[PDB]
Amino acid sequence: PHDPSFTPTQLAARAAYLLRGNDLGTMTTAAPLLYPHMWSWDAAFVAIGLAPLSVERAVVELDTLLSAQWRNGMIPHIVFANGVDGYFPGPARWATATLADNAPRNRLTSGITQPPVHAIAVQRILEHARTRGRSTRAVAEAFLDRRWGDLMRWHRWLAECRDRNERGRITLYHGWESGMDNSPRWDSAYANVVPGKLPEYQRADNVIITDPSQRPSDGEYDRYLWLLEEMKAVRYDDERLPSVMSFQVEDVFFSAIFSVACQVLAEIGEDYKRPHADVKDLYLWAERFRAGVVETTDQRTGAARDFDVLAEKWLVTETAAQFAPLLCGGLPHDRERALLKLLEGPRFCGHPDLKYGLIPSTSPVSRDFRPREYWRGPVWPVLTWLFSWCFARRGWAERARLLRQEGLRQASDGSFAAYYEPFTGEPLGSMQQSWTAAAVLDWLG
Amino acid sequence: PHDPSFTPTQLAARAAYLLRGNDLGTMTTAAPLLYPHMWSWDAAFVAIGLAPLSVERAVVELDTLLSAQWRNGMIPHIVFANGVDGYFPGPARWATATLADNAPRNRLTSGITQPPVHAIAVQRILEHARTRGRSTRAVAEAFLDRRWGDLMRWHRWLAECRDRNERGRITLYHGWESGMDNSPRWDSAYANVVPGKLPEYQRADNVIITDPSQRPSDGEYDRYLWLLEEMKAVRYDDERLPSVMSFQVEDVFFSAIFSVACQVLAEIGEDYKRPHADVKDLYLWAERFRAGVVETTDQRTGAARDFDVLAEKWLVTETAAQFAPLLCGGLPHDRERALLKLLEGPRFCGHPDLKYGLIPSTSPVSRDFRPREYWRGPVWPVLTWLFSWCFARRGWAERARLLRQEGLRQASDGSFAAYYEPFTGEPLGSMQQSWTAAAVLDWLG
Amino acid sequence: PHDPSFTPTQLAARAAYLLRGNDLGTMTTAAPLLYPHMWSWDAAFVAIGLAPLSVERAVVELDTLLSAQWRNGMIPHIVFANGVDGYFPGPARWATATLADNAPRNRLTSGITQPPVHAIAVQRILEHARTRGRSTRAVAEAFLDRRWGDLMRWHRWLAECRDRNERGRITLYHGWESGMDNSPRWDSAYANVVPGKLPEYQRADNVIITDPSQRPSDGEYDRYLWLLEEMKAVRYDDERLPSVMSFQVEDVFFSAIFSVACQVLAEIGEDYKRPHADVKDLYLWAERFRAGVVETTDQRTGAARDFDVLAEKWLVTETAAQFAPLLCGGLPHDRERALLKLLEGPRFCGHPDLKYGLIPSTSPVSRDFRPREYWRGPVWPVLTWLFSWCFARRGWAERARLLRQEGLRQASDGSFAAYYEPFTGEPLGSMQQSWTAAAVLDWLG
Amino acid sequence: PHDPSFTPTQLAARAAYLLRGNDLGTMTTAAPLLYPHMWSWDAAFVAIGLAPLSVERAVVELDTLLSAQWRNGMIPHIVFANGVDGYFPGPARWATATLADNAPRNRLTSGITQPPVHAIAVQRILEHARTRGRSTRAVAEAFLDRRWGDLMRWHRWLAECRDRNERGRITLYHGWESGMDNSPRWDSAYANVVPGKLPEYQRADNVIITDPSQRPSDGEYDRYLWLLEEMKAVRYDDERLPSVMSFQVEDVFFSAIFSVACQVLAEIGEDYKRPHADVKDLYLWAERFRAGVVETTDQRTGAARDFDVLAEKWLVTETAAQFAPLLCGGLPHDRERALLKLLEGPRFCGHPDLKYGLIPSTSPVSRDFRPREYWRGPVWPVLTWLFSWCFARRGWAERARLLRQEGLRQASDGSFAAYYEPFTGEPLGSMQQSWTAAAVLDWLG
Numbered sequence A, B, C, D: 001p002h003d004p005s006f007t008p009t010q011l012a013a014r015a016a017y018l019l020r021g022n023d024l025g026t027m028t029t030a031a032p033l034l035y036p037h038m039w040s041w042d043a044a045f046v047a048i049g050l051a052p053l054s055v056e057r058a059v060v061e062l063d064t065l066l067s068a069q070w071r072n073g074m075i076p077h078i079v080f081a082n083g084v085d086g087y088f089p090g091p092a093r094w095a096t097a098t099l100a101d102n103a104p105r106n107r108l109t110s111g112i113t114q115p116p117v118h119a120i121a122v123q124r125i126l127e128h129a130r131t132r133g134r135s136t137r138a139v140a141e142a143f144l145d146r147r148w149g150d151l152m153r154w155h156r157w158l159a160e161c162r163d164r165n166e167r168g169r170i171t172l173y174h175g176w177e178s179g180m181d182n183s184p185r186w187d188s189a190y191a192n193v194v195p196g197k198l199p200e201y202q203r204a205d206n207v208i209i210t211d212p213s214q215r216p217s218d219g220e221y222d223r224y225l226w227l228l229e230e231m232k233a234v235r236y237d238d239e240r241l242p243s244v245m246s247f248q249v250e251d252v253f254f255s256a257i258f259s260v261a262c263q264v265l266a267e268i269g270e271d272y273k274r275p276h277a278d279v280k281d282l283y284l285w286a287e288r289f290r291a292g293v294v295e296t297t298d299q300r301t302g303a304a305r306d307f308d309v310l311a312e313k314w315l316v317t318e319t320a321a322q323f324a325p326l327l328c329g330g331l332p333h334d335r336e337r338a339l340l341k342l343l344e345g346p347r348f349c350g351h352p353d354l355k356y357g358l359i360p361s362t363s364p365v366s367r368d369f370r371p372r373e374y375w376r377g378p379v380w381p382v383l384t385w386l387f388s389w390c391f392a393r394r395g396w397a398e399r400a401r402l403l404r405q406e407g408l409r410q411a412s413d414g415s416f417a418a419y420y421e422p423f424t425g426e427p428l429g430s431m432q433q434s435w436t437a438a439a440v441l442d443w444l445g
């Protein structure tokens, strides 16, 4: 009644209880109702949240994700659970098992990718394992032995097939690959997707999630599905995709994450005596994509811009993706101070109506802002976690601590919502979201 | 390495993670390997540990236990899980489904009982539910509606069938019913059990638990099983059991718990407008068994004694059961001060070699003390929990806090062992014990 | 900014910082400017707050107060700091140094008393000292050797001089002695106090606290000061006050505190082998004042009433003092359930407009309620602490816990105010009150 | 008894209690009896410890130190408390009031300096103040207005007067200025200090700390005091010290601190709009001293070496000062990995006999190691704090965390010692050291 918040220990217990409840055996669902399968970057966050509970089970999560890796290195964004339906588009719609020569054997997966946060999860598992003694270190190190080459092939497929022109930015062929499906970032690119006649479909996500204010519209999923048809018509061939996709964007946030991931993976490889050629490639990619992120930035504010490859125009929007350069580094001193000022000022974390000092997914003063609508305004604990972890790595200890502290306060209701209304703090969307429990577990220490 | 202990939040998360991992769906195993079924007083502790995580699931645990209640009110001490084997004596050995007219339908259970801590679990669920708002209160109150009469019938069967002469003490027909199977308390009663030819058996608990120093011997399980044959030969008939059992003891610790349970259940019934006749009976039983506990006590020390009904002699041993009167109250002032002095002095919590200020199951200076052997010396977190909760209820706030604090320190290794070596703090016995996680969760708040 | 409150460690640090900043050397001021001297029941709370910081300095605080005890055993309610002004009425107005034959020789004091919480402070000092090792235990035990006789003389003075008819209630000759100067409890008794020729004066208290809504009015002060003239005219002679005092009330809250204090001090004397005749006297007084409190109570609700000795009339008001019987026990079971229901319902802690689940000094629905006016409504952390500590001693562990939780949450702003607006939570009166810091330190542990 | 340590809240409270008890009013003593005056780098730590208690009082502590700054910008290492004795050498021995033209007019000080951690204290004060609201921010900002020029003059004095050749390292004329009086770093430099006619004296430091194994020897003090005679003979003239001083060493640890401090103060001047020419100077010095530190380093391990200016020889010793480059950055990637390996391995933090995972002041395997002797081996919480804070600024969040965790665990005894025996954990030297309390308060948050 008077205080619906949970104590830190009650909150940690409930978060761990949620993670174990979402565990199907070898994979954790992204969320029981809305997302009853394994999602790629949710799984990396899940592995971080499991690392304080069981290094063995955190490793199993990544082991299961990488068993679904495509022949060519791509980590698909969904690994479908054995016979679980409920979700759409499902494996039948994707048809990767019969169409894609690179699809894995005895996993059903999607045909698209998602951001490479996995090296970060590996670092956190390693750091936990080193606090727990010899046998737990053995587990983490045996994992590195098993999966280092798979991780390299993941990073190499991004660097060679989604940055074909060595521009230092990752090209996406669907907004789902950004992790921020309905972000204002992609409105103008989706606006140029004109679909033909697409096979008949019954939407599945809105049956469970009632409120249309906290879900995407019906015109969105028509184009969302047309892109799937385009990929199918070329059997998900990497060499043919540029010739046919009606959606081709360089995602600057995805690219900054990849830069950071490369640097983290490189330092792991140094510490664990991995092949020198692998470490050298990872440092080369880290620097290339740092450079590719900085090339997009506004000269006065430092704001990073996405790039629409088909239209050949910078996508200028006011979302949290503008702060990509803060994650990977590389901006000139003055331009970075300018970007921190934007982050902390009234267009983002300093907006006077915000309940928490946290980063809204879209600026409240932007014309595209919708306080309830996924990535068009709400605050996402997973973004708070990622910014706070990257800020700590830049040496911004106090900024990272402020994000953690406000993130823990917002999460203390124990809804483990995927996102929160930025003004009222109302939990929104799916409750029971695995990666919000994971963020809380990693924060609480 | 330097500090193998977990922080309070890490420990709470791991405890909740263990409880959810031990959940079969509607019941929680007492321990994954050694005890893969539902045990009666473990389940009550499990429900307490679940109450901070999910009032709904805490209620389900007790709902599942009471669906196995016998026609006559007895709560059996094991509810066997659907088809899980591994344990012995199993349902085949017990044969209650075909022999006992009172056995439940579509549960497999044992034919013996275990201490009535369930009202305490109900209180803790109620107290949690009242902090969580209207819908969670509705769940707890709907449970009371469903199960109040079952709880009354539980208490009434103890009061009328295991205290047939209204002496205010519970008679047991097997040491397993005490919850402290191999306690020195029962050595002289087991010594008078001479068995015939008992059906051939292969012990199951020692296959998983290697060390014979932390398990009971082979002569113990021969008599343990002979008693089972005696109960079978009279189809578990309550009226016939006194005529035939070779083991009949009044358990003073069990009786003190029942007294406390009656008082707790009575106060619940007052608060939730249960029938007046039920509340009045519960207060009558609380006072009868308080009186029955006090009648056993040594006039100088207050130590409570068990009673061997067949031998007609007070069982004088130096175990933690001597402190039964401290739980239920009723001793004269001076005699209670004397008993607290014994509890805190060098024969128990004040012994100079103890690692924690906690109650050893048997006094280290006793001839029967074995530092590694179950209830013959080790410290059990479940006993710490129960003494600390009962002490708080007597108003001994500081004593209760000291027990909690030392219990949390001992448990901070995260083994969730059932018992610990009293001198070195080594975790012993089964790890992953549900009710040790439960105690930690309730303590941490 | 986004959350003004402090973490538990920051709060504990700031409480300790305040307590040391108010330390004049051997005494601690009740508040820096408003109350720049030693108050008697504040000093007990101060000693409780110092015990986790320094047992040696906690003992010093009580040594200093007891060095000011009158020759007849009275502990006076103010011990003035040498050569400190800024509080009225000061030493010159009281004129005890010149008029009172029983006043101390090396100290300047007031000529009235205050509630006997001192034994509770001695119990907290002893409980802290027992956890800290041998040299610290010796410090606490030497304090007992040195001051047990003084504590007995304090309790004996109250029992014989302020309960001359052995009614088991404490008579007060000034509302200041209740600790609740402007409580509605005293309104009708004050209306019968007619000041005669009262020598001129200027308040100093409302030059520091200038908001007129937070302190008593001029008219109330004229009566407060006139009572001093009546005492001074008989030179503070115990034997003459009944014949001359225009204010004579039996204070049931003070009486319940005394009952508890006697029982606490008796238990200490048993533990530390004090003379048996003293322990016997203390247990006798504990019971006598318990019965005297219960004798006052409403037959339906259990509410305790003060008694106007001059008017020979029960004083019926709706203040926190009604709950006196919950502190000391003694009510029939049914009427204590009713009384608890009154405490927890809409007239007190369950009032729907309260910011915290705490006890307002006057019921929000009483005609006498004033949300800002001292003891006429505001929430006082000192009352919270006493209720929570005494509840825990009754065995009401969850009730005590909830009051402690809500008190920490209210106190988390770090103002250390003496009282708070019950609806908005605004801190009122003087900031930096030592006994609020002390409550916070004891709660946080 | 069973666990001597304190909870985080009890520890925080006791740290704050100590800091306020050492407060003389406008300055805080370094330790009650041993160091009963204001030491310069202790005072910076004191200001860090006060910032979560009172921004106003933290600012006062730095105001008091800066009011004692010399006319040429030097911050002297002792500001003597008015009319306080018990420390030698006191104001009369130093004779700065009479001999030093640059000494302050309203203050008595020493005639040597100490490391410039002051800018780090200003950053912590500002970070605290930004979380506390408008009036508190104004207090911190007014401090900046009032003292920025003084801080610049401090940094400028070091950069121009103690690095006259622009080598980017700070020359010291007394081992006391390093903060590490008896470090093995200075042994060979001290062996070349020959006292002439040295006026008689009695130590006061080893009358308080009487165990001869914890303080420097008589022979060391004769050299310490003779250096004072050489300074006094040239009236503390910066321009003459190079010609007369028998002790002239470049201190690489002091130099790294200065590099960090310059960078911190530059960042503050940018945030708070200080003159651009000042920010430019600070960034220039930051880089110059970073390069001067790196120039000293071992080509294989990265270890930094001090330089004996008179002997023109690198000083190779195995102390914590070797790790100077980790504070300020600048090493090539490979050699910093080597240096981190040295810090974490068996020669320092990974030595198998260490009670805590902390940095001993001298390596346990060095011939110079002495487990009790001041800076020749003991673990100093001040070093832990500086390393952990600077590590976090490098982005090594887990390394910084581990040092903070081990430092809290060592400090949890509440002794607030300045240094600890590396193997047993025994607190050494003076208890009640303010800057250990300050580190604990900052760590606990």
Ligand SMILES: O=C(O)CO[C@H]1O[C@H](CO)[C@@H](O)[C@H](O)[C@H]1O
Pocket: A030, A031, A035, A039, A040, A041, A042, A176, A179, A180, A181
């Ligand atoms: O891809 C989709 O169909 C839906 O995507 C949403 O759910 C995923 C699982 O939680 C997240 O991985 C995404 O970030 C989020 O936007």
Ligand SMILES: O=C(O)CO[C@H]1O[C@H](CO)[C@@H](O)[C@H](O)[C@H]1O
Pocket: B030, B031, B035, B039, B040, B041, B042, B176, B179, B180, B181
């Ligand atoms: O009954 C048995 O066969 C074995 O009994 C042991 O295991 C049970 C499950 O943990 C506990 O309920 C008992 O207290 C404990 O003694």
Ligand SMILES: O=C(O)CO[C@H]1O[C@H](CO)[C@@H](O)[C@H](O)[C@H]1O
Pocket: C030, C031, C035, C039, C041, C042, C176, C179, C180, C181
């Ligand atoms: O006695 C007075 O003159 C003023 O009294 C107030 O201040 C005292 C010091 O905090 C408290 O002890 C009282 O309870 C409170 O009513």
Ligand SMILES: O=C(O)CO[C@H]1O[C@H](CO)[C@@H](O)[C@H](O)[C@H]1O
Pocket: D030, D031, D035, D039, D041, D042, D176, D179, D180, D181
């Ligand atoms: O300078 C001195 O005479 C004595 O020096 C010691 O005491 C100081 C105060 O704590 C510290 O600042 C030094 O680091 C430490 O070495």
